[PDB]
Design a binder for this molecule. Structure first.
Ligand SMILES: *[C@@H]1O[C@H](CO)[C@@H](O)[C@H](O)[C@H]1NC(C)=O
Ligand SMILES: *[C@@H]1O[C@H](CO)[C@@H](O)[C@H](O)[C@H]1NC(C)=O
Ligand SMILES: *[C@@H]1O[C@H](CO)[C@@H](O)[C@H](O)[C@H]1NC(C)=O
Lengths: 445, 445, 445
């Protein structure tokens, strides 16, 4: 994939092109079980040091089970309810009588198994930890008599190792009110996640996509606590299904565009708004305004469409003609005599104003470019850093082609006397009507 | 508790009612001690593998103590100073000579004990870990001679388990400059927190409230590091006292209300501001503008009044008459031809504009409602999801009654030519004076 | 250092003076190596409990190595690229053939060593964990034959302890796409960080500065994953170099300034903008608008100049004469009949409006000051808390001198009829031109 960039001198904005989409549009739920031991406290006149270590680890196991129980007695509402109704439907199905027995029977001989629940959902279940078998076979002979049997020291170490995953899963589920994201290796080991991906009802390119980007998959997944019932701890892992794949995506970068008069109080400014990620999606454009909601890897963007707005494809014409009548290109006009810079995919936009010292350097050649007052741009070819005032930024050294599209700054087309300055959420046509209305009060006068 | 909701078609806003408050108004401080061992390094010609393991764990203990020491030599200021003066007053009292000896003497025979400090505060102290007794009884005979004694392997495991809590407490206190929130199970185990709640000078309903919502209590608590002095590590846990209980609380949801003309550039919009949580409090209303500052459980809201504004109770009349002269109902008027949705407690508000495809579906019946252009609403009765453009939201399936309050959208009462569009922080009366002022320039002309 | 404060009654703002700077201007990169064992799976008819524990820990080691391998096959782009080009240049140099052999040879006999890479960077390398020596000397004799040798139980415990740091480093590098900040004790122990500081090519006062503020140094550092190659795991720790030291720094606090007419709808307001941290820097002022980007210790501020704007030193004259022609003092004018408070370094600003009950109390004397309507201030001398409505704030009890600079509130100099209210990003001169333009439409009429 070839990454290219285009700087528009007329609007002080840049577009980084050539990116491929992977937008989340669906969910795949899966049940993760941990087999627990329904045991009660036994005291057996025990004092041997190995028995003490075992009972200590057993009390940490009992407190972990009761803590998970108080999590299902009262579950605090979360801000994620608009994205977890699928996993929640699976957890509500699990509360029916006989359904946990159903997954418990299917996982009697194997760790993984497909189970058709009583709500029409054919989920993939697995058993990642078996504490009922371990406690009842290796531990119960110790606390289960008049005097305690002595366990070997290997059992003490193996049980602290096995019980550890229960304690960390209980910690993540406890602090997050039963809904965690991202999904940690405690909730699902990388081996278990990759094995779950291979067994999903998805295409082979989608298994290769999710398997090569497991950390992004984890960051776009949810782990939801279901129930502790009948010696079973069940929780749902909700994994993303990327319904939009390989559609063009581009990132818009914007910076203030002011006039450069030498007398303060006579300058006006404008800045394009709605900078962020754009991806073609189903005849429209999916826009991602928050900056961290889209993870980038090698020219592929992984977004969740729940963090998007749906815009007409004509929004791209703000990049080709900001004065274009098919879409009303949005701007803001607060004045700004302060310098700033934006590091793009293949270069840097610099808005230099006032007395600020703006420059672009190469590590071994020194200063190779000095920006004048106004908005300018430099590619990463031969440039390592950009300095604005007392701040030094690093330019991304990724390969690609930049194109400097020369053009007159549109802020110069505006009469300062009637310019509407201080517009927070405006548009090109909004500014033009405010100019026609301020010009009519002078036309009559 | 019955949750109800009301959608106001006239203002594109909804109010979710029926919630009970629990607002934090006071603090209960408590001292948590860890008994340390004032020991120095001893080298004893040791090479046996068990001795090596013990000295390794002992060096991790010494580095944890010196790290806590450099935390009290220089404590970085935190953004939490406006909420921890109570716990800080207890830590400053502890620095007096003889006060740490006082808590150290009261906890000579028991783990928990009430102590009257020299500043008039009767605090509940406890001793959650005893490393001085363990190191001096089980470890000192090993490093304390010409040649080292051999410890049994159970001691090596028990000491790594005991020293672990010191290392994790030191890690949380080190990365957070001595002030951590929420309070982790390392700072205070769930068993210790519940035991502390039972012993507090609070009513039995307040102990039941805090004990049934321990994770919310932890998230609204602070752990403050006090001192390492004379073989004692002391830190304060500051727990919330919920002075406002069972007062009505409601959540306001707002969405843009535009006109739906078919020609772009001729539409105006308004949006109610100050969406969030409202609770009746002491003759006024406590408003919570940040969304995540109030945790919800089963119809109970748990807020910290430090994240609130105090408003007159007439602010509720924006929900009954936005044109009401007792309170100046605030709005913003930026234009917005972009569609959006808000998931409420019992349904969903949809602002559909332009060509956006807005719908509400049931999982098995399909699309059951198509929104027209404008602001509309649908209850969760029979609805599972809402789709706006390329985005699908899940509707909360909580039981309650919704009421659709029909009314003419107030944006239709405004002449577009003189509407003040692009108002960031405005009000209904603010907009009306700007309309009277723009109408006077035309009245004379 | 003497901390002083100045409240300006005329503009409802305060300046906390007397702070010394430490601004980050450069980076010092360092290579951290972990010697790994290139081993493949061996199965040896083993069933003894100690052998099982060892093979389990060995599988967790192999999955940690393959997980780090999939992190270097595909590295997701991060939002930190503008600040890590130095460490990234070191990681790219490491990918050259023979360069990892170079650091591997220099660290053949010692843990720490200076290495001149093939890109002109003289970095300090160290070897914090040696798993190749441990696995090949203590573990290989177990899995390396027809039947497995039996390890002693001390080896099982020592290997779980040693392998633990690899698993936690792999976890932090996995969830963060190879770039972590702050730098944890797993990436670099406090002992290793202090040893690295002592060996840096910096002055003795800078080593004392960074050694006394290690947690702030960690929070302003980066750990970047380099490569797993030829039995070596290498990653770069990028530590801050504080190029600006002991320059004056001050913190500006602002609060709304309204008129106090008794009839709602007749009041206007203004609020100074650009509250935050200011530090003198290289003939200009470095301004830090985000509040948490500057850590404060004992009168020293530690900022990263990447989170700053560069302003002329005349910006300080907004504190002495807001009407001063050398710098256009910025304000916003949204109306606000809501009360609020700002806790400063030595007191509290209170903006009391409407019916709000504002007061300042001492813990033992009770209410000692009642604020009237308007903007006022109280020092921390004798004051413990400030209550505004239903909210109680704690006043910082730090010693210093406050100065109450009396003056007429400038909002009273404005005619309400022509005031531009609802200005989002304005200035004193911006407001004056809007008043001259609204007065010209009345002058002719
Ligand atoms: C301003 O007036 C000109 C002249 O008739 C017209 O062509 C233009 O469309 C007007 N602008 C707006 C935004 O109405
Ligand atoms: C606008 O003018 C009308 C007509 O006198 C008056 O009743 C109304 O109060 C005015 N609005 C404002 C906000 O002053
Ligand atoms: C407003 O008019 C006065 C009178 O001439 C003038 O002195 C002042 O500079 C003007 N203000 C602005 C911002 O132009």
């Amino acid at each position: 994939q070839n990454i290219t960039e285009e700087f528009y001198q007329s609007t002080c904005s840049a577009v980084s092109k050539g990116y491929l989409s992977a937008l989340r549009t669906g969910w795949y739920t899966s049940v993760i079980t941990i087999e627990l031991s329904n045991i009660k406290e036994n005291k057996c006149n025990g004092t041997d040091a190995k028995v003490k270590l075992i009972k200590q680890e057993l009390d940490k196991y009992k407190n972990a089970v009761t803590d998970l129980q108080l999590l299902m007695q009262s579950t605090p509402a979360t801000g994620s309810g608009s994205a977890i109704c699928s996993g929640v439907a699976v957890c509500k199905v699990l509360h029916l009588e006989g359904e946990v027995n159903k997954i418990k029977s299917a996982l009697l001989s194997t760790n993984k198994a497909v189970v058709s629940l009583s709500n029409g959902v054919s989920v993939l279940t697995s058993k990642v930890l078996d504490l009922k078998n371990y406690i009842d076979k290796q531990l119960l002979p110790i606390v289960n008599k008049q005097s305690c049997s002595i366990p070997n020291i290997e059992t003490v170490i193996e049980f602290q190792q096995k019980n550890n995953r229960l304690l960390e899963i209980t910690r993540e589920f406890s602090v997050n009110a039963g809904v965690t994201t991202p999904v940690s290796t405690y909730m699902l080991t990388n081996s278990e996640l990759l094995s779950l991906i291979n067994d999903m009802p998805i295409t082979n390119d989608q298994k290769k996509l999710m398997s090569n980007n497991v950390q992004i998959v984890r960051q776009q997944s949810y782990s939801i606590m279901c129930i502790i019932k009948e010696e079973v701890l069940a929780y749902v892992v909700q994994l993303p299904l990327y319904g939009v794949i390989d559609t063009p995506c581009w990132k818009l970068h914007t910076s203030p565009l002011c006039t450069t008069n030498t007398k303060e109080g006579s300058n006006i400014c404008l800045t394009r708004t709605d900078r962020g990620w754009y991806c073609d999606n189903a005849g429209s454009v999916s826009f991602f305004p928050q900056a961290e909601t889209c993870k980038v890897q090698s020219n592929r963007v992984f977004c969740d469409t729940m963090n998007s707005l749906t815009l007409p494809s004509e929004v791209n014409l703000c990049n080709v003609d900001i004065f274009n009548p098919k879409y009303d290109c949005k701007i803001m006009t607060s004045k700004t005599d302060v310098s700033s810079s934006v590091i793009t995919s293949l270069g840097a936009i610099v808005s230099c104003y006032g007395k600020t010292k703006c420059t672009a350097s190469n590590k071994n050649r020194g200063i190779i470019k000095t920006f004048s007052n106004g908005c300018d741009y430099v590619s990463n070819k031969g440039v390592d850093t950009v300095s604005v005032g007392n701040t030094l930024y690093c330019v991304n050294k990724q390969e690609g082609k930049s194109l400097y599209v020369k053009g007159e700054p549109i802020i110069n087309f505006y009469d300062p006397l009637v310019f509407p300055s201080d517009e927070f959420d405006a548009s090109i046509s909004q500014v033009n009507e405010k100019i026609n209305q301020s010009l009519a009060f002078i036309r009559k006068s």
